[PDB]
Amino acid sequence: KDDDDKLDRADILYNIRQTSRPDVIPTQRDRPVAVSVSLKFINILEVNEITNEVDVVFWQQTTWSDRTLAWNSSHSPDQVSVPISSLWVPDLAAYNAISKPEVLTPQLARVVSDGEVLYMPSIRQRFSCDVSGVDTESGATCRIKIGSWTHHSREISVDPTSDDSEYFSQYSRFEILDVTQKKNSVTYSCCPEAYEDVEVSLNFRKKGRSEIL
Amino acid sequence: DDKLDRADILYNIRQTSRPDVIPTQRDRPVAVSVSLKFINILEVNEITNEVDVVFWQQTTWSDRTLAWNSSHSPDQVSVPISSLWVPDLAAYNAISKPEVLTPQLARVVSDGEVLYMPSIRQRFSCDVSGVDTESGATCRIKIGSWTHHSREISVDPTTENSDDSEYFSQYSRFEILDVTQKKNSVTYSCCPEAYEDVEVSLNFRKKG
Amino acid sequence: KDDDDKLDRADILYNIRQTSRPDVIPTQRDRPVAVSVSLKFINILEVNEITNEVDVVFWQQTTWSDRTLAWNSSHSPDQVSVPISSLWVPDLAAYNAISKPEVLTPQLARVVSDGEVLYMPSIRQRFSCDVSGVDTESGATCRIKIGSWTHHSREISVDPTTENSDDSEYFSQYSRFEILDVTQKKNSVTYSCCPEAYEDVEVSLNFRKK
Amino acid sequence: YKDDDDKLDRADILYNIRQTSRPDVIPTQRDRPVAVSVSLKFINILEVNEITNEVDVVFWQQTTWSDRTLAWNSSHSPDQVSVPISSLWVPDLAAYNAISKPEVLTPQLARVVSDGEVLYMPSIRQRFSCDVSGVDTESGATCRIKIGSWTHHSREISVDPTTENSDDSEYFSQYSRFEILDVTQKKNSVTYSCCPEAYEDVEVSLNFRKKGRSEIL
Amino acid sequence: DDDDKLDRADILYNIRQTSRPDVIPTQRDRPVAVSVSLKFINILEVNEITNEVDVVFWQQTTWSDRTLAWNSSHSPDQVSVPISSLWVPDLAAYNAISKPEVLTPQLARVVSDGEVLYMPSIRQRFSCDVSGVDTESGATCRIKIGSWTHHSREISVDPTTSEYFSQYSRFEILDVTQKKNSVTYSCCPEAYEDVEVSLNFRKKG
């Protein structure tokens, strides 16, 4: 009932900008920042079986908490939209991306009165992954690994939260069999740091395939 | 055309404008009217079900806090959109960034109405089958606020049906049979919020 | 003889930045701002007769006046270069452009002591226009329509030049195409919905494949 | 390590770095050149054009140097923080044979270590003019990439390799059309007969080949 | 003294206090003398159908601004400076058909005597006669570089009075000339001083 009180929203934005530290990780209770990531695939635009590359569009549902941003919403809006330039956002990258992430949507996040932040850009991006079997019944399984680029596991944990039937375009030349998203840890022989990431396994295949029976 | 009046109006708008806060008046959602006027259909890819199009995105809404008495001053001024709140519209089936081809200025009217109408080039995933037939193809584009649900913003059409004869290029390979624009509400199973959108059905065919 | 007086130039630039209102149309008295636009074609890069599209490069000579910027040049520079971010510039758009105007050149304008402003970017841009006849002796005639995007005729008037040429001084000798004629006609656009009229110049590019 | 998640500590370190940092001045200590270490970890080879002698590749550019004025005592505070590169001096590296801008695929953050070490490792997609002859043979092609400071000569910046040899097995995509045989990185000093200054660069030699070189037809 | 950091910071501070990035550094009420020399690095994406060519070149650009000079008897002789802190000539390739792609860090060198050197590596496309590219006589590209907005009374742009070209280009250079040229248009009285660069090349073989 108080959502549409403009002055209240303006004051909330003011409060957020006073407290927000866009360049500092919001670690609370001496624990790493728990970042949840879930990709909702919207389309598969191009796949190349020779080069093992895919071109896809997905909604990157990204959530985390910063309780320093919280406010009492007993008589004020429960949520507001905030430009991400005013907020800290996780420095996520896909390890096997071969193009820049192209953000297709307005760069606004939602901040909830309990301090939860939700940012969900629609991203088009190209990846190097296993496209073998895309023209078969069992299809291909393209794996995409996403994690913090510069923050190791003691600082940020990136965690997962389907056939994406609610999201995936019915007009794609491909169809999604299954999308699994699992916790994964990465370490390199040179160095002690581990990186937490989510491994997204996209199992898909070409629609209306012609087979030899 | 009184320059000092215009400068003062712009000053006033910038003193009052809150570019990041939705202009909810009373305790109601912001009513955003959107109407796409198609100008060109550049490419139609039957292999991939994709279209590349150019359209004017006629967008209007009110912010009465911007209003002024224009009895003896200009009725409207042009304002850079960076000085204004503008709705965070996005097309759900866009597969490229909206490319704005025109100067990023809005008109503000002395009654507080704002008109923003970018020319946009953008690619979409949609049903392209039938494009070379009498019935044509019907490509549906859903547009709405990306982050504001129905209690905060309503996105509504103006003209429900039009052949865009005043807008669409006579030199295109294609012709417009009908552009239908209707209110549409989207909810996802995961969450309670609804998003109020305009569903734009672009029915077009290859000229022959 | 005072053009290269550096302190003079710095002071002129200072004065312009004190006076200039980059977001307000420089209307003088009770009249629209008169804007002249002349396209000088450098090249025609690609033409598609099936889709009726062209890819061109041109110098967009744009002139207007803001008398509030004028100064007494009797013992100072006649002109200076000014970043366009410091100036009001006409919000011109090509109504049949199908790509963003790509500016190839430094974004500087000239301001003359009498208040004339000249901005002439080199632009690469694609258009939807009539390419029919490009392979004939008479060639194709592609019309490019340019006017203010948000200012109607009471606020900005776009006045065509009286020039008639094949742009021999500008156009690449090595283009696959040849320009037969480039002309401009004043035109006014109105839509049935609304009373406002928008002034434009229609630039007619008559060209053919060599 | 126990203090890594102390948020106020991190904010204060960032403030300190921003008070001390001179983003446009080389961090010369004593009167010695800034020692810049560079190591390219190749991830993908996207395109190899045998007609034109061009390659399009993705690599992680591991770049390290020291600015001891940024150091702090981390006995009871975070050992490292992430910092936007706009707040830091970064070496003005360029590849002499690049034919496209470096496209940075990742967030533009560096790590600053409490001893003053800085680590910046962007993933970069870039195109190069190099020798691709032999890519379809057993011995492969060897594409050499020369990287150095664009405007600082050897008295001001030295650009040196880290690891001499590797097949990048931990980094290179197993799904590429190509496979890496060896990546060698050597110091190289370049002077032009016109002028006296020398530029101290790294020559990166990427020896790679197409998989499945024996085809039917 | 070159690697004295505080000295370098102070020089940068001094340059920024005196630099007027938007005002031409005309001295003695004479035009700014800008010297330009292109070093060709590569010839790429040559299209014989469309008569277009990509070139990569280092654009060696020098001029002086004596107000930037300092006494370097006990301090650095030279420093690197972001070009945003300096006036730089507004050079353009008048005839180019693509945006210049600057491939290198946008830093200039400032010498203690006030000399400035800026040398971007640039990739850019041009309209050229490519018809003879596979013949002994070859193809020709003409590139005209000058100030975009400053005429000859304000800026003079003159040519400076195998080490660089890629050994892996498909093409080889037959000749390069870089000549003083003054460009005037029938419509208007101003002349623009430019360097006319003629690049003659052919496919190897």
Ligand SMILES: C(=C1/CCCN=C1c1cccnc1)/c1cc[nH]c1
């Ligand atoms: C660096 C990694 C691995 C995980 C991805 N990000 C980073 C990173 C770390 C720090 C700064 N920038 C990027 C690395 C892996 C081996 N040696 C260095």
Ligand SMILES: C(=C1/CCCN=C1c1cccnc1)/c1cc[nH]c1
């Ligand atoms: C999010 C949606 C759906 C409507 C489009 N915008 C949003 C959105 C909402 C909030 C922030 N950014 C985008 C969503 C989440 C689960 N399911 C859909």
Ligand SMILES: C(=C1/CCCN=C1c1cccnc1)/c1cc[nH]c1
């Ligand atoms: C708007 C037009 C037509 C001329 C082009 N610019 C505008 C415009 C006007 C105002 C703001 N932004 C663009 C329009 C509206 C209905 N019919 C045409």
Ligand SMILES: C(=C1/CCCN=C1c1cccnc1)/c1cc[nH]c1
């Ligand atoms: C310039 C060189 C050497 C190659 C690398 N960088 C530079 C450089 C030097 C200074 C500023 N910007 C670039 C040069 C000049 C004549 N010959 C070579």
Ligand SMILES: C(=C1/CCCN=C1c1cccnc1)/c1cc[nH]c1
């Ligand atoms: C203008 C030229 C020719 C040389 C290139 N720059 C300019 C210029 C001059 C002023 C501002 N912006 C560009 C010109 C040529 C014929 N009529 C006008």
